[PDB]
Amino acid sequence: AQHITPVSEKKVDDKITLYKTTATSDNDKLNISQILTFNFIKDKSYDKDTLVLKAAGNINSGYKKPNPKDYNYSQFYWGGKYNVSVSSESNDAVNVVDYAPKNQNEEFQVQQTLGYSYGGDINISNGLSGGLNGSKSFSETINYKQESYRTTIDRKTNHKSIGWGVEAHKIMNNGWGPYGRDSYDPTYGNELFLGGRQSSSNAGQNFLPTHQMPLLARGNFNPEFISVLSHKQNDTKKSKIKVTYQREMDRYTNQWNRLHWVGNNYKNQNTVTFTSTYEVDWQNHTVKLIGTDSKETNPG
C-alpha cells in the first residue's frame, strides 16, 4: 500500500518555511516498511534548500521459533544486524550535510531532537522535544529501541551518502555473558542463545526462550534516522534519493555431542534488502516513487 501525502506548508518564522510530505513504501513479503518524512526547508537568508529526511517504519527480524521436536540438532534465524542507508544521486547540486545519530551509540533507547536555524545551521539535543504547532523553530526527532545492540555510522558515508548499522552487541543469557555474534568458549562454542549445557530437553527446546531474547533479535527493528541534505538554489533539476533497509539474518544452532551441548552463531547467513528510490522536486517540495528493489540472498 504505497502512498504519498499532500504537501503541507507551515510558516515557521519570518525567514523559514516548512513544506512536509510523507512517503510510504512497503514489501509485505519481506516485512519491511519505509515511512519517509520529507521536511523541505526554505530559508530567506540562505542560498540552499534543506531537506531534513526522517527514515522510519519497520524491519522484521525474520525470526521464526524453532521446532520443539528437533532432537539433537536444532537452529533458528534471528536479526543479527539492521542496516539503513540514504543516498543522493542524479544531481551534483545535492549533498548530505548532516545526520542523526552522529555518533556510535549503544544506549538502550536512542532519542534525539535535530533542529534547523537560519543560515543552514543544524543543532542536536538529547531527548525528545519540540515539533509542535507553536514551536518557533523547526525540529524533527529520532526515537528507537535497540537494547543489546549498537548503532555505528558506516564508513561509506560521504557527501552523497549516509548509512548506519545496528548490530547485536551485548546480549545476556540468564545472567551469563554478555555474548555477541562471535563469542567463543572452547568447550561450549557460542552460548549466546543456548538454554543449558547439560539439558535433557530436545534441541528445539534447548534455546534461551523467545521472550528472553532481545526484541531486535526475535521481533522487529523500528528505525528512526535523519539525513540532512542541501540543494543549491541555482539548480533547477530534480534529484533522486535511494533509501535502503536491510537485515542480516544470523543462524543460531545447537547440538548434543554425547557429553554436553554446543552452540554456534553463523553471521549473516541470509541478507534481506528493500530499497525505494524517490524523485525529488526541490521547487515544488514533492516526491515521486521511481521504483523499489527487493532481494534475499538465501531464502528458505
Residue numbers in the entry: 27 to 326
What did the publication describing this PDB structure actually write?
The bicomponent pore-forming toxins have two separate water-soluble subunits, one of class S (related to the slow-eluted component of PVL) and one of class F (related to the fast-eluted component of PVL). The S subunit is typically involved in targeting the specific cell type via the interaction with surface receptors and in the recruitment of the other toxin subunits, leading to oligomerization and the formation of an octameric prepore. The prepore is composed of alternating S and F subunits and is able to assemble a β-barrel pore domain in the cell membrane, producing the mature pore that ultimately induces cell death by osmotic lysis.
Crystals of LukE12–311 and LukD27–327 provided measureable X-ray diffraction data to 3.2 and 1.7 Å resolution, respectively. Each of the two crystal structures had one molecule in the asymmetric unit, and the two refined models included amino acids 30–311 of a total of 311 for LukE and amino acids 27–325 of a total of 327 for LukD. Furthermore, LukD–HlgB superimposition results in an r.m.s.d. of 0.97 Å. The phosphocholine-binding pocket that is occupied in HlgB by a molecule of MPD in the pore structure or by a molecule of phosphocholine in the structure of the water-soluble monomer is occupied by a molecule of bis-tris buffer in LukD. Since it has been shown that the core of the cap and the rim domains are rigid between the monomer and protomer in each member of γHL and that they conserve their relative orientation upon octamer assembly, the structures of LukE and LukD have been superimposed on HlgA and HlgB of the γHL pore complex (LukE, r.m.s.d. of 1.67 Å on 232 Cα atoms; LukD, r.m.s.d. of 1.66 Å on 246 Cα atoms). The superimposition of LukE and LukD on the HlgAB complex reveals conservation of the residues that are important in the electrostatic interaction of the protomers in the complex. In interface 1 of the cap domain, Asp44 and Asp48 of HlgB and Lys15 and Arg16 on HlgA are involved in the interprotomer electrostatic interaction. These residues are conserved and correspond to Asp69 and Asp73 of LukD and Lys43 and Arg44 of LukE. Indeed, they are involved in intra­protomer hydrogen-bond interactions with Tyr141 and Tyr142 in the stems in LukE and in LukD, respectively, as well as with the main chain of the stems, indicating the importance of these residues in the transition of the soluble monomers to the pore-complex state.
